[PDB]
Write a protein that binds this ligand. Structure first.
Ligand SMILES: *C/C=C1/C(=C/c2[nH]c(/C=C3[NH+]=C(/C=C4\NC(=O)C(C=C)=C4C)C(C)=C\3CCC(=O)O)c(CCC(=O)O)c2C)NC(=O)[C@H]1C
Ligand SMILES: *C/C=C1/C(=C/c2[nH]c(/C=C3[NH+]=C(/C=C4\NC(=O)C(C=C)=C4C)C(C)=C\3CCC(=O)O)c(CCC(=O)O)c2C)NC(=O)[C@H]1C
Lengths: 475, 478
């Protein structure tokens, strides 16, 4: 449930309440440009940023209450045609203006209200890059080209590709940075660090920046909309003031400027091309457009490459599965055959541990909890219904196995025969990796993942239940 | 199975054998630009188009056997780095050159051989950005397609821009059109599998752009025609400048099309369709502008998928409401026949059908346009022969030979048995397909309708699924 903004008696945005901050309505913009609001039908200017007077070369009451018909005689008709009444806030029209200098007009309609962003403005890298992304072999190499290309175009100090995991937590899957900067490659950060409110907004509008992290915001006058005495939804405005709670996060990293392009796959915020500069840095509108193209070109290509990887992954697993089933038919001893490192039942499910259980007894393979602990676990496994069991934290699902986290935090089991006398049981180790900020957010991520293992890829869980069925036939 | 090309004693490309034409190897290019081939490792120039001598300002033996290291001193290193050995033919590098004028260098590697396309180069500003957002904020596939054809026409200034959508059976349809005032409309017309051969489809899935800048211009062969590396024909498949098939050039000339262009719309490794473009006079799109089309080609390739799947979602959502409104009256049922014949329920409109046979309580009724009295008896007698609860077809005339005569009233079929066995059953029926307005457009439209003899509109899978849901619901109405 949202809070009111700071300008409507709303509360302090602390670190404990920040998931409720109304970030779509700061009623203020960044000072590198200027903002007007106007009535959708009449084109009557209603609101205005304080600096807008100066950005344009007209006096602060002369602009207010004026028509866009008069102000933008050439643009106003074509503008209005480009944005129908009732069309979505996602739809943006851009044109350039020739003024006393060159200005980049960016427009979008939030129903009744038109919003107008002004910024100052004036070869084949993108085309070559598009083809590079397409002819990349896998998601990792795709991500590398993405971060690399974005850095070559912008000249940012750091360009990460931040990938969201199923549990809303993030990971830097790729990085392209300046020589002599500390690497975030591989680091992971919690759900908390990018709130749901921001995620949801980043799914609608696929670009936002923070041109200077220490610059003061420029409020709107009036702050509230004369139409509806309601706060002006700047959610889909580039110039929107960035959250002060997040600006602080960036300042504590020594980030002078920020930028992030949303990578959206099938109406789902898959990730961000996240960018940092160590000094303030305003990307030109003409160049940001290039990023937005990549943002969508990547949004396609992620999906194509990622699904093609998952395909080739399970294809490895079918071959591995069928090589087990080969030796499982020609079986001298059920335990001997599966313990065999040539078969590698650990490597099929990529596991730190494994319990083979057959003929009224059990063996281990690899790193596994102590002798009595396994007996307790196998005793517990019989309690479960169905042929297949699964978890990313057996410590939770089974409280008495909290102590067994280090050797076996994550679990994937299957019963060979029905009932758990004869069964295979994969086990994975507890996960581990290498005040406000990323030092703390990395630590607090690992704190969120206490007694948590790497989760099981669905292809592994499916192939497990295939192997479950195959090994019943080995009897 | 491919034929050899015309330059290796290969046969005449007739209209009956053309699905075998080796269109990836014409060993010739269009004269609006020039082409070099070079060795991948050494950069040694191997092949050359005849006009290349003149396009560059160097003599026809001076260029041959020369290094690219010498010829393109600044580009050759960056070029070579951009295209690794063993990288795919899809990957293209572009740069501009400053020569005695401006040239547009386009490069791609086919394994051992580098291929280099030269075109002359040097409006508009935010048209693409605005257009990208327009495509995104379009409400449906139809409106998306309209913005696409419209935008492409605004950028290029083509005489006609169609969006040609492939159907499941490889046949095409012009789902949208943006054309010049005073030109004959192809909007709605459909064309067979034959008119875009499998060889071309497959090539158009790999490389997402090809043109025909002048339909009556002569091709410019390569010298040597065969590759000095492997005495093998030079695979120009992924070259813009590749000579268009003469069999297709004839198709365009018989439409009065002077220039052509088409961008592939690929969805999930599948050739979904083409943004097809025509100009009535010859017209060479600038490289810098074609790039813009290629962006749209991919921006659309995403957006098609998003809009098309979101339409299919909202479609089946209509069908759940319709289904549940039937199941409402099916529980509160005075008479099984009376309730379903009711036009308020509209069992025709659920499956969008020209006919319907209601069969219950040892007898049958019709609704809408349906074959004669004895014909239905023969059909229902036949329906009992089929296994499973559900039956389906786009041509019952084929599946059931004795119902060939029944095509006009009922060419397409979707049936379901209420109880198990076909005593009690619902049977939707669709009319034979038809539409309104010796090689070209108006033969290919006629020959399409000839391919669709005794064929109805096919059943959308959402309709077939909802049919089998309704099948289960109406068993519970007993
Ligand atoms: C209690 C709330 C917190 C909070 C709020 C917050 N964060 C954002 C937006 C972003 N946060 C990002 C997080 C990271 N950037 C990094 O570089 C790394 C690690 C290497 C992390 C984890 C990112 C990338 C964004 C997007 C914007 C950008 O690229 O700068 C918002 C929304 C901002 C806006 O647009 O108005 C908010 C409200 N962040 C916290 O850490 C806690 C305190
Ligand atoms: C027996 C073989 C035939 C044949 C060969 C052929 N066709 C193409 C490429 C295209 N054919 C297209 C068909 C149409 N264009 C239209 O405007 C309409 C109707 C309104 C149709 C049905 C199209 C669009 C293409 C793509 C290229 C373009 O836009 O011009 C090829 C491949 C050409 C190449 O790139 O080398 C071939 C071999 N076409 C026939 O009709 C029969 C005779």
């Amino acid at each position: 449930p949202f809070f009111p903004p700071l300008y409507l008696g709303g509360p302090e945005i602390t670190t404990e309440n920040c998931e409720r901050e109304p970030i779509h309505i700061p009623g203020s913009i960044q000072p590198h440009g200027a903002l007007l609001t106007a009535d959708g039908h009449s084109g009557e200017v209603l609101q205005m940023s304080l600096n807008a007077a100066t950005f344009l070369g007209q006096e602060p009451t002369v602009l207010r209450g004026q028509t866009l018909a008069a102000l933008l005689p050439e643009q106003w008709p074509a503008l209005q045609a480009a944005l129908p009444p009732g069309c979505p806030d996602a739809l943006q029209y851009r044109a350039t203006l020739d003024w006393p200098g060159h200005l980049s007009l960016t427009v979008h309609r939030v129903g009744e209200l038109l919003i107008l962003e002004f910024e100052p403005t004036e070869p084949h890298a993108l085309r070559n890059a598009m083809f590079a992304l397409e002819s990349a072999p896998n998601l990792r190499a795709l991500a590398e080209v993405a971060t690399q290309t974005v850095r070559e175009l912008t000249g940012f100090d750091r360009v990460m590709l931040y990938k969201f995991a199923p549990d809303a937590t993030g990971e830097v899957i790729a990085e392209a940075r300046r020589e002599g900067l500390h690497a975030f490659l591989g680091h992971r950060f919690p759900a908390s660090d990018i709130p749901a409110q921001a995620r949801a907004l980043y799914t609608r509008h696929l670009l936002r920046l923070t041109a200077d992290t220490r610059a003061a915001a420029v409020p709107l006058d009036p702050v509230l909309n004369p139409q509806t005495n309601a706060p002006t939804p700047l959610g889909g405005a580039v110039l929107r003031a960035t959250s002060p709670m997040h600006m602080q996060f960036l300042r504590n990293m020594g980030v002078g400027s920020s930028l992030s392009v949303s990578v959206v796959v099938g109406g789902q915020l898959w990730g961000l091309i996240a960018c940092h500069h160590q000094t303030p840095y305003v990307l030109p509108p003409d160049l940001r457009t290039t990023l937005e193209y990549l943002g969508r070109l990547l949004s396609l290509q992620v999906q194509v490459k990622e699904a093609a990887d998952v395909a080739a992954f399970r294809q490895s697993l079918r071959e591995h599965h069928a090589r087990v089933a080969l030796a499982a038919a020609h079986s001298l001893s059920p335990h001997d055959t599966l313990s065999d490192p040539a078969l590698d039942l650990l490597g099929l499910m990529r596991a730190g541990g494994l319990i083979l259980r057959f003929e009224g007894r059990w063996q281990t393979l690899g790193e596994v909890p102590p002798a009595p602990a396994v007996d307790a676990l196998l005793a517990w496994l019989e309690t479960q219904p169905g042929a297949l069991v699964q978890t990313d934290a057996l410590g939770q699902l089974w409280p008495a196995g909290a102590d067994l986290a280090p050797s076996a935090a994550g679990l994937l089991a299957i019963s060979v025969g029905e009932g758990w006398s004869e069964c295979l049981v994969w086990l994975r180790p507890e996960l581990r990796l290498e005040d406000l900020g990323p030092r703390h957010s990395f630590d607090t991520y690992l704190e969120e993942k206490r007694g948590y293992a790497e989760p099981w890829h669905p292809g592994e869980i499916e192939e497990a239940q295939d192997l479950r069925d195959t090994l019943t036939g080995a009897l």
